Design a protein around this ligand. Structure first.
Ligand SMILES: [Cl-]
Ligand SMILES: [Cl-]
Ligand SMILES: [Cl-]
Ligand SMILES: [K+]
Ligand SMILES: [Mg+2]
Ligand SMILES: [Mg+2]
Ligand SMILES: [Mg+2]
Ligand SMILES: [Mg+2]
Ligand SMILES: [Mg+2]
Ligand SMILES: [Mg+2]
Ligand SMILES: [Mg+2]
Ligand SMILES: [Mg+2]
Ligand SMILES: [Mg+2]
Ligand SMILES: [Mg+2]
Ligand SMILES: [Mg+2]
Ligand SMILES: [Mg+2]
Ligand SMILES: [Mg+2]
Ligand SMILES: [Mg+2]
Ligand SMILES: [Mg+2]
Ligand SMILES: [Mg+2]
Ligand SMILES: [Mg+2]
Ligand SMILES: [Mg+2]
Ligand code: NA
Ligand code: NA
Ligand code: NA
Ligand code: NA
Ligand code: NA
Ligand code: NA
Ligand code: NA
Ligand code: NA
Ligand code: NA
Ligand code: NA
Ligand code: NA
Ligand SMILES: [Sr+2]
Ligand SMILES: [Sr+2]
Ligand SMILES: [Sr+2]
Ligand SMILES: [Sr+2]
Ligand SMILES: [Sr+2]
Ligand SMILES: [Sr+2]
Ligand SMILES: [Sr+2]
Ligand SMILES: [Sr+2]
Ligand SMILES: [Sr+2]
Ligand SMILES: [Sr+2]
Lengths: 194, 237, 119, 46
RNA sequence: GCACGGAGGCGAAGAACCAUGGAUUUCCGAAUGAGAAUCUCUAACAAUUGCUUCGCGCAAUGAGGAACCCCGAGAACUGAAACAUCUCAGUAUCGGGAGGAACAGAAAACGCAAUGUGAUGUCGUUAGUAACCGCGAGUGAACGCGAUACAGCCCAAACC
RNA sequence: ACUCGUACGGUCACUGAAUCCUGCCCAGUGCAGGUAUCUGAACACCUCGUACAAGAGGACGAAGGACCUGUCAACGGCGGG
RNA sequence: GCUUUACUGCAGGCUGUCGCUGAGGACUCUCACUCCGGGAGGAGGACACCGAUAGCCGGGCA
């Protein structure tokens, strides 16, 4: 039969309809009064969290992060540029907001490592995402068969090097064939043309 | 070119800041629960550096010593009242609603409880014209009819120091001293006397704006100089 | 709160928990929102409990309507940890389901009745 | 000026370094203090 | 010791010297009790975190490293015989981060269209080809093939 | 920032103590106001086209402009016959 | 370097549109959101602010 989880999932396919709509309208009011990064005892989207690797265990932390909406926040050129490099307003950044959110969260918890993240809505001026972070130094995790992999040294600061699911997508690594000529194995090795 | 003086101002550097560390206090009305059971005694009259007008130090019943925006005719020893039931006399503060029409007022609040925003300068006063249950109509010093929430507090009388403007500075040195007590860069160099690089009017063999002075409201900073969005100019017509 | 359409009296909540406590000692009961949900889906449930202090609410928002289109009766409990205790748990429980009572069918019956009445 | 205890220790060291290469080093190495400084002709740090 | 002096000393109680391991290891320094131009003032994981016996009790982070590597920010001189798209170039330079190597990686692939190939780097080639472009100057792949090396697995959910 | 400021304020400009004065010009340009009608983009809407989409056309029409008015101690102008 | 009714652009301002954004060609309401208030509460209100886009102006800047 359907899992209880599938019901949370199904509710979130249309965050603007049904009960979920009213919950968000209520919640966001509180969220707007909270800081940039707020640790929370439980995921707002359980199905999504467990689906991404979340477990109700010691060493597993979840934090909600908000970020200002819109495009880039850039300073116009003080020195001469050709029409092309004079653009200022419509130029957007290369990292999506989810990625910016994952990094702020990881900076807040220097000792934890980002595992994954997901969207929990937005209003007209900001977006919220919840991030799952793991304590690579806690034995409850060093002994977990499904998470101990994140304890390796090469996994340190993984989010800052784009090793996150959101990181990999944003780097155009989704496709294995056509279109990934300049993304795989890295943007840098391909001269930054992807 | 280079940023014009008007643009240098906004950075808020020392040259353009007001000598705040030298200012006395912000003459905002007292905050009262209600009842008007608040009265104090004028303990001294002082000079307010920021307004070139006098201010009165008051000692209230509950032990609070604070400077107040003084109307004309307030002296040491006098008793002042602040509240809904306050008496209707010079130096007292109470909501417009409690004030009788046709009474000159000063230090009028914009939004009930803000502390006073209007008519705070030397010898000025707002004139409470109309009353109501939803709107108090006041005539501000500029002559404009302002609709205010009857709950906005004000002080009966006109501001002390009137006539200050009737005497000429006579010499630059006097202007100088006054300017040193304000957030203002002085003296003033005309735009037409500068180089083209420094102002829209700079440059040219002889001095003269090389353009019409009436500038559009939409002009960007750096260009908005001269007569801003003038509805007209001159004295004629 | 968004899934709670009626308030249950402290005294009615008392009887229900007791019934649930004897139900675990006698009959069979389900602990957890997932197990509870499947019971309602498999139709193998007589009475389901749903705490009111569940955060996030998503976890249980579906119980009410899911129960209605399945005829299964349900009741609200104020505390999450009480339901877990009454269910015989060392932890809390967001929702519970009495899968076939046990020497409490008479009470579970009355409870379901007092609720339908309470709308 | 007003020297701190530390400044004073550094000044002291510079004064010490300002000595001659001992004569015996001459014989031993069988044939200059390249860091010879003058208070006037030179400038120390700080 | 460099360093060929004078004086004196050590070494058969096996010194010197060399390898491995250990001891000592001032102050400043990420610099961490507070402060400070390497010192001073009155018990210290300062600050952010995780766990928590909720006590800094147990732990993490911080800074360095020749370049290499990953993720972000991103010019202009220059070329086009001017110059704006284009070029120089994702170069220089900047911010953040890991390792001994990084990154990638077990197909919602390929599409020599097939009765065919079978994770991913990389090297040779495919090729200055296809494609782009004031269709100017210029920019410029991929599949495949030959090699190198080869390795494939774990969750979420259903049912408990 | 101005600003512990509030029109007797302070911002932006021109002229340059006192004294006697400061004429005519609103066509152009600038600013501002108004505007029946005209013109005026995108989204949504309507017709055609497409089993869809590209696309073509339509209706509506904001600021702006056309047009009208105010204004020279606003740019400036004050000739030839 | 400087100028402008040179060319081409870029900030910036005004204006429409979409999102934020809710209930019953003109309207009421309150519940988001904004402001005032020490607080209670008051004012405003689906506008404004902010994201996106479109038209106009645009030597302030390149
Ligand atoms: Cl990380
Ligand atoms: Cl003045
Ligand atoms: Cl093949
Ligand atoms: K160029
Ligand atoms: Mg590589
Ligand atoms: Mg004041
Ligand atoms: Mg000054
Ligand atoms: Mg001057
Ligand atoms: Mg000059
Ligand atoms: Mg200029
Ligand atoms: Mg002149
Ligand atoms: Mg002159
Ligand atoms: Mg000596
Ligand atoms: Mg220290
Ligand atoms: Mg050239
Ligand atoms: Mg050419
Ligand atoms: Mg290229
Ligand atoms: Mg291919
Ligand atoms: Mg397993
Ligand atoms: Mg002069
Ligand atoms: Mg405020
Ligand atoms: Mg220029
Ligand atoms: Na971290
Ligand atoms: Na010297
Ligand atoms: Na040592
Ligand atoms: Na530490
Ligand atoms: Na502790
Ligand atoms: Na050339
Ligand atoms: Na040239
Ligand atoms: Na081109
Ligand atoms: Na072949
Ligand atoms: Na004219
Ligand atoms: Na020059
Ligand atoms: Sr680190
Ligand atoms: Sr004030
Ligand atoms: Sr105040
Ligand atoms: Sr000029
Ligand atoms: Sr005139
Ligand atoms: Sr619990
Ligand atoms: Sr000298
Ligand atoms: Sr293989
Ligand atoms: Sr004169
Ligand atoms: Sr005119």
């Amino acid at each position: 039969a359907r899992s209880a989880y599938s019901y949370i999932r199904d509710a979130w396919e249309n965050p603007g309809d049904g009960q979920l709509a009213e919950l968000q309208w209520q919640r966001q009011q509180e969220w707007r009064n909270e800081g940039a990064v707020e640790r929370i005892e439980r995921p707002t989207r359980l199905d999504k969290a467990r689906s991404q690797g979340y477990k109700a265990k010691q060493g597993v932390i979840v934090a909600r992060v908000s970020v200002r909406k819109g495009s880039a926040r850039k300073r116009r050129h003080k020195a001469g540029r050709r029409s092309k490099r004079q653009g200022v307003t419509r130029i957007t950044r290369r990292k999506d907001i989810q990625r910016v959110a994952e990094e702020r969260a990881s900076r807040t918890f220097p000792n934890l490592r980002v595992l994954n993240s997901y969207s929990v809505g937005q209003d007209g001026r900001q977006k919220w995402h919840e991030v799952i972070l793991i304590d690579p130094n806690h034995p409850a995790i060093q002994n977990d068969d499904d998470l101990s992999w994140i304890c390796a040294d090469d996994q340190a600061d993984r989010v800052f090097r784009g090793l996150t699911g959101a990181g990999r997508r944003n780097r155009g690594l989704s496709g294995k064939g056509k279109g990934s000529e300049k993304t795989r194995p890295s943007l840098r090795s391909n001269g930054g043309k992807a | 070119g280079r940023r014009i003086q008007g643009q240098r101002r906004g950075r808020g550097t020392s040259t353009f800041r007001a000598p705040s560390h030298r200012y006395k206090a912000d003459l905002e009305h007292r905050k009262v629960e209600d009842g008007d059971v608040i009265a104090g005694t004028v303990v001294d009259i002082e000079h307010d550096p920021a307004r070139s007008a006098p201010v009165a130090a008051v000692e209230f019943e509950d032990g609070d010593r604070r400077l107040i925006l003084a109307p004309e005719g307030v002296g040491v020893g006098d008793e002042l009242q602040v509240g809904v039931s306050a008496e209707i006399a010079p130096g007292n503060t109470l909501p417009l609603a409690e004030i009788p029409e046709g009474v000159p007022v000063c230090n009028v609040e914009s939004s009930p409880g803000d502390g006073g925003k209007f008519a705070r300068a030397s010898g000025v006063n707002a004139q409470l014209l109309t009353h109501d249950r939803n709107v108090a109509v006041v005539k501000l010093p500029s002559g404009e009819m302002k609709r205010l929430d009857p709950q906005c507090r004000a002080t009966i009388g006109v501001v002390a120091g009137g006539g200050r403007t009737d005497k000429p500075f006579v010499k630059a040195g006097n202007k100088h001293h006054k300017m040193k007590a304000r957030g203002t860069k002085w003296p003033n160099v005309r735009g037409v006397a500068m180089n083209a690089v420094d102002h829209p009017f700079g440059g040219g063999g002889r001095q003269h704006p090389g353009k019409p002075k009436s500038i559009s409201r939409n002009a960007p900073p750096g260009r908005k100089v001269g007569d801003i969005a003038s509805k007209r100019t001159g004295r004629g017509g | 709160p968004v899934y709670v359409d009626f308030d249950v009296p402290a005294d009615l909540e008392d009887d229900a928990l007791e019934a649930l406590e004897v139900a675990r000692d006698t009959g069979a009961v389900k602990k957890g929102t997932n197990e509870t949900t499947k019971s309602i889906e498999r139709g193998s449930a007589e009475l389901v409990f749903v705490a009111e202090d569940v955060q996030p609410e998503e976890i249980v928002m579906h119980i009410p309507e899911l129960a209605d289109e399945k005829g299964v009766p349900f009741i609200f409990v104020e505390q999450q940890d009480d339901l877990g205790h009454a269910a015989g748990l060392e932890v809390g429980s967001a929702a519970a389901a009495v899968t076939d009572a046990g020497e409490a069918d008479a009470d579970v019956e009355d409870i379901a009745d007092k609720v339908e009445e309470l709308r | 000026g007003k020297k701190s205890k530390a400044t004073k220790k550094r000044l002291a060291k510079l004064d010490n370094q300002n000595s001659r290469v001992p004569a015996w080093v001459m014989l031993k190495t069988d044939r200059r203090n390249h860091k010879r400084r003058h208070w006037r002709r030179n400038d120390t740090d700080e």
